Design an enzyme around this catalytic site. Sequence first.
Site, PDB file in Angstrom:
ATOM      1  N   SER A  34       0.880  -1.166   0.000  1.00  0.00           N
ATOM      2  CA  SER A  34       0.000   0.000   0.000  1.00  0.00           C
ATOM      3  C   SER A  34       0.920   1.219   0.000  1.00  0.00           C
ATOM      4  O   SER A  34       1.864   1.303   0.794  1.00  0.00           O
ATOM      5  CB  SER A  34      -0.894  -0.003   1.244  1.00  0.00           C
ATOM      6  OG  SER A  34      -1.801   1.088   1.234  1.00  0.00           O
ATOM      7  N   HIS A  92       3.503   2.099  -8.247  1.00  0.00           N
ATOM      8  CA  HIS A  92       4.716   1.304  -8.143  1.00  0.00           C
ATOM      9  C   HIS A  92       5.206   1.228  -9.588  1.00  0.00           C
ATOM     10  O   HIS A  92       4.426   1.449 -10.530  1.00  0.00           O
ATOM     11  CB  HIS A  92       4.414  -0.110  -7.646  1.00  0.00           C
ATOM     12  CG  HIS A  92       4.241  -0.215  -6.164  1.00  0.00           C
ATOM     13  ND1 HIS A  92       5.246   0.082  -5.269  1.00  0.00           N
ATOM     14  CD2 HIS A  92       3.185  -0.617  -5.422  1.00  0.00           C
ATOM     15  CE1 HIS A  92       4.815  -0.135  -4.039  1.00  0.00           C
ATOM     16  NE2 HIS A  92       3.567  -0.559  -4.104  1.00  0.00           N
ATOM     17  N   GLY A  93       6.488   0.944  -9.768  1.00  0.00           N
ATOM     18  CA  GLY A  93       7.015   0.846 -11.114  1.00  0.00           C
ATOM     19  C   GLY A  93       8.362   0.182 -11.247  1.00  0.00           C
ATOM     20  O   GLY A  93       8.991  -0.196 -10.254  1.00  0.00           O
TER      21      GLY A  93
END
EC number: 3.4.22.56
Lengths: 238, 4
Positions: A34, A92-93
């Site tokens: 999260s 996110h990445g």
Amino acid sequence: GISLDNSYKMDYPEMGLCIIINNKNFHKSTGMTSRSGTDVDAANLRETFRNLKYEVRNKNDLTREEIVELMRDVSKEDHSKRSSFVCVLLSHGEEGIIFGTNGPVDLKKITNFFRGDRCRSLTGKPKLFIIQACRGTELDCGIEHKIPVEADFLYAYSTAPGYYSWRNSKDGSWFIQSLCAMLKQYADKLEFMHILTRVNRAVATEFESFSFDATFHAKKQIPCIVSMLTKELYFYHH
Amino acid sequence: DEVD
């Protein structure tokens, strides 16, 4: 009188759309955490771009399918009366990848919808993609006629290629905190590349990570401005 | 501080 064509025409009836994709909660099966503090980022961006006269649309917790469909639908809109386009991605990445709540989306898939040949009402107009996401897992230890289809794009990345991007659970991300602060102070004074250079300095000098884990402690970050713009960008006119 |  003599005319100079060095700056983008930013006096259209509308400044344009500012699409903010705020992904906080991810599907349990992805194993992604999260993103605490991202709501502070989304709220800061909403207010910052509102004051810059952009039509802000905030979208929360979108799947990979929903991200692609939103981008496709937005690119199929009539942007003729709009000066520019802004898309902010908070997720996110990995390098060249942004995460939907259920999986990854190639950044190229998202940006391709806005190519000079695919979104005609945006041809010749600045298309800004602000990306707050990791670009890999490296940590910075610190020290001390026709026009191209890829033209008129600016990618304001939060971090250098191959590196992690930092986000504070209470204050929001280092990059977005800095971007909003610099836009609020300098949007009526400086050109965009110069505002982004001030953001590079802010993130580079004012922030350092704190962690009980030695591997993630005392780390630094530098953003990455990627410009395919052909003219200077000022948020003001007249 | 957390990473994305």
